[model samples]
Target: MANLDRSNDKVYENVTGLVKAVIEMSSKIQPAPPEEYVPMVKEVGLALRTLLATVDESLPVLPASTHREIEMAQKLLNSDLAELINKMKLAQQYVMTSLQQEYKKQMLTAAHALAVDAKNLLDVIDQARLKMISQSRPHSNLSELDRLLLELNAVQHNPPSSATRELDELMASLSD
Candidate 1:
């Protein structure tokens, strides 16, 4: 609901908007199909564009608190945050499977594609949550989407240079 102009926050709007758009796109489906995959991927691209725009404007220079907030938000919104956290450990596997075979832009594109793939699973959780809430039933567990949303909020409000740092690190790691 917060506008990009609400604050000078670069990543915030982009991250939030991307999550919102993903949520919206997810809502449009009875159950997301292969046909919707490309659109979902495109939404992630829009998110990437927002990130690129933010990076273009300035690098992230956020404090630890900011990072913590972003982490919380990302966990809030990401239904698969736990899975993603695990996935992070497979960074080498990812590198071997794709990073080794692609350029930097392609790597980013693949990341976006992975995000789109995750969104499908997220859609299922979100729909179930809505259904339960509508029926006034209890929804279980801390939703990752909620945490992810928090991270997105944190990113918007405070830019963290670590994003770029990590990107550079990724490139460097792949240089060998």
Candidate 2:
């Protein structure tokens, strides 16, 4: 029994460490130049994939609370990170075109907003990671965890207001 407990602890520690490293890598992403953003995103994507695999392997042994944390992390990675990557790709595509200046600017603005939201989601994940590590046992309420999950869902599904406004204005100008 003691040996099994030790093994579980080791698995938890490994997963938490990977989460921390990924958060560190995520911080560099928003500051990267447009030309470099895709590569940085790819790097983080690879890291996230590995982290998810690690979590999946340890799932059976994970406490319920720890399992919830891993699931929330995976949800953010899949939805929020994927959306950010798509937006970056779209921005790059627009950059390659001869689109009107205003249209290009709007696309760029929207993409920047997506990047900001992506960074914010990462910040939330980092906070959760710290909370998990510092706790003697996993949190029982999971209220904050649930809230962060909703925030990630919102970030994935809804563009920032500023970005939406820019998009709306751009569309109106086009039809005129």
Candidate 3:
């Protein structure tokens, strides 16, 4: 929705744009080779913190309730990613490349979770913009009150009749 206030809309666009970038970056990091596992995990941790910085910068510019949801999503993302990295490191010590598939699966799952949260954040932002735009002004009720009243008035004008054919001819013009 177009808005009278440009700053509100501007922050929204920036946050959504960065979210897509985060998703793309994490997707690339997901399929990394076993040899690069440590470096990739470190890189993802960096990505996560950078994403956090973006959210924090945009936080005050967004709706307050929306900030609540964004924080919750961030908390879950950190916890899950941290746990996966822990499991991944344990595999580094206990398991070799042949048995590394299971740990690699963890990374795939982590990236998918990251992408999911990013998309959900987009949805949260979408909902926030919708609410802000709605609150900015009122919409006309042409589709609700007035239109229904018009339809009721339309059906009211038909002639009263007991017999079908008797009313049918009178109602012919009204049928349309």
Report the number of the highest-lDDT candidate.
Answer: 3
Residues 1-176, candidate 2: write the lDDT tens digits: 45556554444454344444333433333333555644544543444444455546656554344556556655554554445444544544554464323232333344343334333433444565566668876441234334434454344343444323433443343233
Q: Which stretches of candidate 1 lie above 4 Å from their native place?
A: 1-7, 25-30, 60-176
Can you tell me which runs of candidate 3 are displaced by over 4 Å?
1-34, 90-97, 134-176
- Model 1 poorest ten-residue lDDT run: 100-109
Colliding residue pairs in candidate 2: none
C-alpha lDDT score of every prediction, in listed order: 0.39, 0.44, 0.49
Ranking of predictions according to lDDT = 3, 2, 1
Which ranges in model 2 have alpha carbons more than 4 Å from their true place? Answer: 1-35, 65-76, 97-176
lDDT of 1 by residue, 65-173 (tens): 2334334334333333322223332332444465422222232333433344434333333454356568764531235546554453333333244444443453344
RMSD of each: 15.4, 12.9, 26.7
Global lDDT of model 3: 0.49
The estimated TM-scores of all candidates read 0.30, 0.38, 0.53
Model 2 residue 118 distance off true place after TM-score fit, in angstroms: 11
* lDDT by residue for model 3 (1-176), tens: 55545654444454344334333433333344556665544544544544555555667656576767777766665565455556656555445545555554554445555544544565567677578778766441213333433333333233123222323432342223
Clashes of each: 29, 0, 0
